[PDB]
């Protein structure tokens, strides 16, 4: 009687949704056709006899990815008319997907959301995935969040956004729409998790020893993180954690809800079994700055609160004996007004392996969600990138001619300045 | 969906199209009789982009062929793949322009253009979702440079929101085949900047240089130059007809490569290009593709790109390859050449990946970069124009058909203003 609905918008969102939906189907024993040859209820729904239907909706204005989905092996799984598709792409223009073509599509998505919500009885909250540096992704994510915040109100929404890397970039105009989308979801999303690609590339290179990774390898790691986060809702555990038990433990103030994640262990089968993978060493590896899932240095800032999930055969006393060691270290310092900052969850189900993938099978794993003061650097560098081109009003004509006003750029800049001032104000000791 | 129609004018444009359509048909496995004989399923999924469907199962291009004399279209019909073109789309006059811009734009081109506009309107009104138009014509001829540019304005007046492409061959002073080239080049550039959403300049001199130095073949002919131009043309829209990691339609390139609405004159290049005797020596790798892609001699224009700074750049990779390598190589090509990239817009290179390579090749790259080095072509064109105009040479031919010298003065002034304001941003600093 506990449910959650995941929203996938944009090319990156759909490509990570595919990645998480192989993993969930594999973890619950459901074949790609949707047929089994009481834990499924969190992500799926029973049709009365036979197949299961995911509680997910796919959105995009550009039809190529959806058409690829509707012809692959998973054509029989998803309901045919929840893969909403458009005709014309926003083409990396934020104003297009927020003012011009997204408005005519958003009504169908909201109707689908209502039709899925009326089925659930214990709706925990929503999940949303969107790559920020694109037109349709950021614009439609903003519009959907704004509609949901007023249609439903206090229901919790979680956002797994992928911000651009510090120096590596695929587009040339992504700072503009990244800043605008951050403006939009700052006052509209309860949790936002950092996911830039460069850090995960470094993780793959160093640990998985892959020298030529593709997007699928990144999306599989993200899917594993999602599964670790939501395992506690569908498996028995000695110390459970619910989604609603987050803003009471990781969010000191309503404005501050951007945090960065990490995962451990990450290791290949060729050298995994030569070492014992004790809980102490994995919880040490999880706190290593080089294993952050976002390219930010935690040594440059304080910690505010750490929520970290275990799964497997871990015993609570071993967890406490390792939290003490971390509190001992002099290179990790917490904020003054937080004496204890750890929330611990323990689950019994070990992580599942996907055949043909990178990760091996292990009995212990740890996933941490940590809120730290050091996150302000990404905001500062994105702001610096934005200012350089906004000084000469470059690329603005592509946005003014799509219905957006001239002054809309300035207030996003002011909100980022306010956020940066707030992060500095919080981190000073009393 | 999101398909485009083909319109070509003049002899040069007709010869370019006669190879462009052959290349497209060979790519999609269409026999010269209009019957599909392809091998892969993907060859038919997005065939509606360029081809229409008729009874009997054969396919017909949605191309419109126009000229002021019937010889070139009477000759292209007898060539290979000449039967695909619908006979109804052939429109021609009985007089010709004689390389006189005034005759092809005021007296003769004005009366004929109604018939071709009728079929153009028939083609555009019918199609599922319009993406836009692409135009091939030469600036060195009268009928082409007149009728094509007037048709550009007529199309823009009726479809202001669609996108417009123009592949324009400008007369180089090295290989000159017509004495009145500067007049109709300068007159055409005046109208082309006001209406074309994108423009791509191509020079015969650069094509001869490439054929002589990179391919090292003894006797270049127009068939080789046409083949290179056709490969470059096909490379731009490849990801719109095939799946890929990061699809990017023409509008997305328009957003990311044009900073200001009047700076839309690009120069392109295709890689790899190797001689017959050295095609076995080389190994196709991403570094090998990217080192040839930014090579100065590889540009399809005689303009020297290390005489200026790139405002932005784009690359459309083809084939199956890792994205991490592409991003790191793009970063490396931008760190080692920081002097040739403008500094007030960071991360000014766009990348895209398409999983379907060209037939016969495992990897290919199409490069489209907006650089400040293009000023040199307009400088020399205007220099020749002002050297010839000061004596009023050959002016009576133009002035005898209702044109005056005031339109020459305005065209020269606007072209010089374009030259000045294009380099204005080269010296701009942050």
């Amino acid at each position: 009687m506990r449910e959650v609905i995941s929203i996938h918008v944009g090319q990156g969102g759909i490509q990570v949704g595919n990645a998480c939906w192989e993993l969930f189907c594999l973890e619950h024993g459901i074949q790609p056709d949707g047929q089994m040859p009481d834990a499924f209820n969190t992500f799926f729904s029973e049709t009365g006899a036979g197949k299961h239907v995911p509680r997910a909706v796919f959105l995009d204005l550009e039809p190529t990815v959806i058409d690829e989905v509707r012809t692959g092996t998973y054509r029989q799984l998803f309901h045919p008319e929840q893969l909403i598709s458009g005709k014309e792409d926003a083409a990396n223009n934020f104003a297009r997907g927020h003012y011009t073509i997204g408005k005519e599509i958003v009504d169908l998505c909201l109707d689908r959301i209502r039709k899925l919500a009326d089925n659930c009885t214990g709706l925990q909250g929503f999940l949303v995935f969107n790559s920020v540096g694109g037109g349709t992704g950021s614009g439609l994510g903003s519009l959907l969040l704004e509609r949901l915040s007023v249609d439903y109100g206090k229901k919790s929404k979680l956002g797994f956004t992928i911000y651009p890397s510090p120096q590596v970039s695929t587009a040339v105009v992504e700072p503009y729409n990244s800043i605008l989308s951050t403006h939009s979801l700052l006052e509209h999303t309860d949790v936002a998790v950092m996911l830039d690609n460069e850090a995960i590339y470094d993780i793959c290179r160093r640990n998985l020893d892959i020298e030529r990774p593709t997007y699928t390898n990144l999306n599989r790691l993200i899917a594993q993180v999602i599964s670790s986060l939501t395992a506690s809702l569908r498996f028995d555990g000695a110390l459970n954690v619910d989604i609603t038990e987050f803003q009471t433990n990781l969010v000191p103030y309503p404005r501050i809800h951007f945090m960065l994640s990490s995962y451990a262990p990450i290791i290949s089968a060729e050298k995994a079994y030569h070492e014992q993978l004790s809980v102490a060493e994995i919880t040490n590896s999880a706190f290593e700055p080089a294993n952050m899932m976002a390219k930010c240095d935690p040594r440059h800032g304080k910690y505010m609160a750490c929520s970290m999930m275990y799964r497997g055969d871990v015993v609570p006393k071993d967890v406490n004996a390792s939290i003490a060691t971390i509190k001992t270290k002099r290179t990790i310092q917490f904020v003054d007004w937080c004496p204890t900052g750890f929330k611990v969850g323990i689950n019994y189900q070990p992580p599942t392996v996907v055949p043909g993938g990178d990760l091996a099978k292990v009995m212990r794993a740890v996933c941490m969600i940590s809120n730290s003061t050091a996150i302000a650097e990404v905001f500062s560098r994105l702001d610096h990138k934005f200012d350089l081109m906004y000084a000469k009003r470059a690329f603005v004509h592509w946005y003014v001619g799509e219905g957006m006003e001239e002054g809309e750029f300035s207030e996003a800049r002011e909100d980022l300045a306010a956020l940066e001032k707030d992060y500095e104000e919080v981190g000073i000791e009393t | 969906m999101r398909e485009i129609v083909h319109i070509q004018g003049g002899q040069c444009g007709n010869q370019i199209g006669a190879k462009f359509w052959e290349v497209i048909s060979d790519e999609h496995g269409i026999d010269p009789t209009g019957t599909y004989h392809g091998d892969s399923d993907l060859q038919l999924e997005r065939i509606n982009v360029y081809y229409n469907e008729a009874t009997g199962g054969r396919y017909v291009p949605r191309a419109i062929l126009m000229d002021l004399e019937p010889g070139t279209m009477d000759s292209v019909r007898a060539g290979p793949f000449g039967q695909l073109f619908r006979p109804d789309n052939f429109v021609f006059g009985q007089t010709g322009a004689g390389n006189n811009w005034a005759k092809g734009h005021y007296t003769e081109g004005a009366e004929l253009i109604d018939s071709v506009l009728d079929v153009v309107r028939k083609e555009a009104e019918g199609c599922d979702c319009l993406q836009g138009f692409q135009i091939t014509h030469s600036l060195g001829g009268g009928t082409g440079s007149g009728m094509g540019t007037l048709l550009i304005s007529k199309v823009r007046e009726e479809y202001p929101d669609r996108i417009m492409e123009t592949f324009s061959v400008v007369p180089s002073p090295k290989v000159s085949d017509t004495v009145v080239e500067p007049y109709n080049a300068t007159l055409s550039v005046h109208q082309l900047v006001e209406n074309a959403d994108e423009c791509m300049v191509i020079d015969n001199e650069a094509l001869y240089d490439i054929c002589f130095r990179t391919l090292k073949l003894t006797t270049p002919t127009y068939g080789d130059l046409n083949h290179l131009v056709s490969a470059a043309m096909s490379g731009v829209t490849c990801c719109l007809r095939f799946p890929g990691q990061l699809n990017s339609d023409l509008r997305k390139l328009a957003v990311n490569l044009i900073p200001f609405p009047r700076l839309h004159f690009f120069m392109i290049g295709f890689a790899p290009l190797t001689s017959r005797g050295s095609q076995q020596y080389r190994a196709l790798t991403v570094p090998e593709l990217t080192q040839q892609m930014f090579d100065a001699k590889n540009m399809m224009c005689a303009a020297d790109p290390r005489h200026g700074r790139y405002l932005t750049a784009s690359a459309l990779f083809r084939g199956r390859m890792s994205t991490k390598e592409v991003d790191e190589q793009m970063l490396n090509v931008q760190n080692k050449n920081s002097s040739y990239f403008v500094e007030w817009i960071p991360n000014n290179i766009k990348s895209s990946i398409c999983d379907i390579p060209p037939k016969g090749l495992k990897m290919a790259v199409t490069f489209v970069g907006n650089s400040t080095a293009i000023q040199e072509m307009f400088k020399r064109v205007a220099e020749q124009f002002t050297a010839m105009f000061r004596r009023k040479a050959f002016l009576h031919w133009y002035t005898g058909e209702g044109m005056d010298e005031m339109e020459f003065t305005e065209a020269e002034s606007n072209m010089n203003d374009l030259v000045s304001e294009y380099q204005q941003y080269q010296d701009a600093t942050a």
């Binding site: 009003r393 004509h397 003014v400 001619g401 001239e406 | 202001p160 609405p261």
Partner: peptide
């Protein structure tokens, strides 16, 4: 559509 003038003012 709006046009940008040389003084960066967008005029309908």
């Amino acid at each position: 559509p709006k046009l940008k003038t040389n003084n960066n003012v967008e005029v309908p």
